Design goal:
alpha/beta, Aspartate Aminotransferase, domain 2, 38% helix, homodimer, mitochondrion (chain B), four-stranded antiparallel sheet, eight-stranded mixed sheet, 412 residues
């Protein structure tokens, strides 16, 4: 008997889980404080809309939403996605007619959407432009499908904006896709209208289709500036074929319902094969849970904008509290979180005597204070650490007290 | 601007969708009758359990089931699958210990389960042994990943049993997997215990992990033979590492909920890479809907057997109506359905004057009587036609009448 795994399976790696699963249990007799899990439902402080809950129960009770829906998603669900994106993130009235239900492909959460978007257009040997720090799943898909990766930087000095010139010099004859993430995981950044327009213009110039992971669309803190807003790559006049990832996992706090979508925007028809590929690849898995698709119209169009706003407003409160108090710990210099559910902090390793790496920082902090953060190395950001900002303030107060004490202790 | 789809996306093909979408709208005024659609929820004659739906609503209201669950599935859901399979299809007492929750990997319906099984162990250039007539998704996944297929025959004359000597003659050095389906789509067959045991023996002789698609597990008619029973590949003492596909899509008639599972069985530990491959491949998509997973304990372990049996009993009544009347049409010689939701009928094309293939039969019957069946060539079985059997008896009474007219009209004297 000589049974081995495939090479395809052999190449599948999720850095976040590897570090998590391999974390040694802490000897410290202190109730663990996890700050590394990007799940917004952990404390029951952020709830999903009542409109969504109610419709989901009615679709189940009607017994007419249990059959097979088309693999791309039901017409009704696809129209709700088109309508919500149009109304919410498309401000120029002339571009509103470019967002249509027929260019919407449903998927089984964000990870499936990513898998579909990359493998619809890239073949083994082809290259994708991926951000760093960046959400680890782009690399997970590329590695397993033998797709090359060119990492372009997002610099903390410029509020995590992308190094447009680095993208420009890296592009080559094998590069078929440009991936951007905004708002960002793990940076917690929110691109300004100018920076998004420049990314779109660069794609145009470079002749690259654009995959924009906009799953945190609209989750922008408005407390420190009520004029702050989200800029979708959909709100621009351009000849660039764009594929936008959206979903309800983050803004409606139901990530386990595995509902997300791919929105293709290409009014001048420069990449119709992209959309065709998306439909082809979706036929391997066959779409998301139909009963959840039936509730989507209601969830997006019948949920008051205030419910969405209050979720973000609670995050902001915890994000701002965390940012203010983390700075106070020897060696930790936080970047300002503008939205999403994360806070990225710089670790000044020279201010410690035993700690030499961001990974080492993670390891010792967990071991001594039973506080779990993620090492920036996982996201291709040595020297930084990722913290979640979705837990109640009371959790961070306790956690920062512990991080402080540990920081003072390892100080040089 | 040169945006071209990848080769992977360009190799993805679904024969059922192609035929259905390219079907010409019929000129006949008679209301359309579709016997081609494999969805059991169409007429609302088959309903899912109250236990399942209730727990689903309770899980939603609780709001403790909306977060992330491990990608292999929640422990509770994995325990329910292990417990329900042990309790239903594993009869030898000593073998019950071999079915455990840690060897269960949840997935997003059957289609996803097949994708994970085939790509977890086969690379481009490797071959898999695939049945014919067979469920198209095996080929869909294989063609798309550049995995070669050795087709083995399931013979109509032997009750659609797998031709074991042809399997043995096709196995080669690149062959990494043996795929079996039972009960079958589209044959409607149910393997006797004896035939399943030789499938297991042959898998052992060729040293090939077995992937058994048992999504219709337990859906066997008990009206002709009351001693009839489903025999899962789990119920045998063997060295063969087995991956079994199971789900709620067919027995609990909720296919759209996208819930299925892979059950790895390998007590002598001859292929642990296979289970690991399953966990790996699943990290790309990240599991099924958590709210659906949270209702699975209740669905399998709290739905009375009477409900499951009653669904099969209604399918059986429609299946037996179809079988006893389809044979009255000139040229249609039906094989007998033992389970699942399908009926496979032979088409003796020599008995007609204008009809040469089964695709012609499909098109002309559609064009003239507005009755849509599936051409057997889709499943790699020319000269046959697949009919669904889950619709009410009234649909078959009118459909047979139109087909009998059609066949008499094109019959060669």
């Amino acid at each position: 008997w000589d049974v081995s795994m495939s090479n395809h399976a052999g190449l599948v790696f999720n850095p976040i889980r590897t570090v998590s699963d391999n974390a040694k249990p802490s000897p410290s007799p202190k109730p663990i404080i996890k700050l590394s899990v990007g799940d917004p439902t952990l404390d029951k402080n952020l709830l999903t809309s009542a409109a969504q809950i109610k419709k989901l129960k009615e679709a189940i009770d009607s017994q007419e939403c249990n059959g097979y829906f088309p693999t791309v998603g039901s017409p009704e669900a696809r129209e709700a996605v088109a309508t919500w994106w149009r109304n919410s993130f498309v401000h120029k009235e002339e571009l509103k007619s470019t967002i249509v239900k027929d260019n919407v492909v449903l998927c089984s959460g964000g990870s499936h959407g990513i898998l579909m978007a990359i493998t619809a257009i890239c073949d083994a040997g082809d290259y994708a432009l991926v951000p760093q720090p960046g959400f680890p799943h782009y690399e997970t898909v590329c590695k397993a499908y033998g797709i090359g990766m060119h990492f372009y930087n997002c610099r903390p000095e410029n509020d995590w904006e992308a190094d447009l010139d680095e993208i420009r010099r890296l592009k080559d004859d094998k590069t078929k896709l440009l991936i951007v993430t905004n708002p960002s995981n793990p940076c917690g950044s929110n691109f300004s209208r100018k920076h998004v327009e420049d990314i779109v213009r660069l794609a145009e110039e470079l002749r690259l289709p654009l995959f924009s992971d906009e799953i945190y669309a609209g989750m922008v803190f408005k407390g420190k500036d009520p004029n702050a807003t989200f800029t979708s790559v959909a709100d621009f006049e351009t000849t660039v074929p764009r594929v936008i990832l959206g979903g309800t996992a983050k803004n409606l706090v139901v990530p386990g319902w595995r509902l997300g979508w791919l929105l293709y925007v290409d009014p001048h028809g420069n990449g119709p094969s992209f959309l065709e590929g998306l439909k082809r690849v979706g036929m391997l898995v066959c779409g998301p849970c139909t009963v959840v698709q039936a509730a989507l119209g209601e969830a997006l169009l019948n949920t008051p904008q205030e419910h969405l706003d209050q979720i973000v407003a609670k995050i902001e409160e915890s994000a701002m509290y965390l940012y203010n108090h983390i700075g106070e710990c020897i060696g930790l210099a936080p970047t300002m979180p503008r939205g999403a559910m994360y806070l990225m902090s710089r670790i000044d390793l020279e201010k410690y005597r035993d700690i030499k790496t961001d990974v080492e920082f993670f390891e010792k902090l967990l071991e001594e204070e039973n506080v779990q953060v993620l090492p920036g190395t996982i996201f291709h950001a040595p020297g930084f650490t990722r913290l979640t900002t979705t837990r109640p303030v009371e959790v961070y107060r306790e956690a920062v007290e512990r991080i402080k004490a540990f920081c003072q202790r390892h100080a040089a």
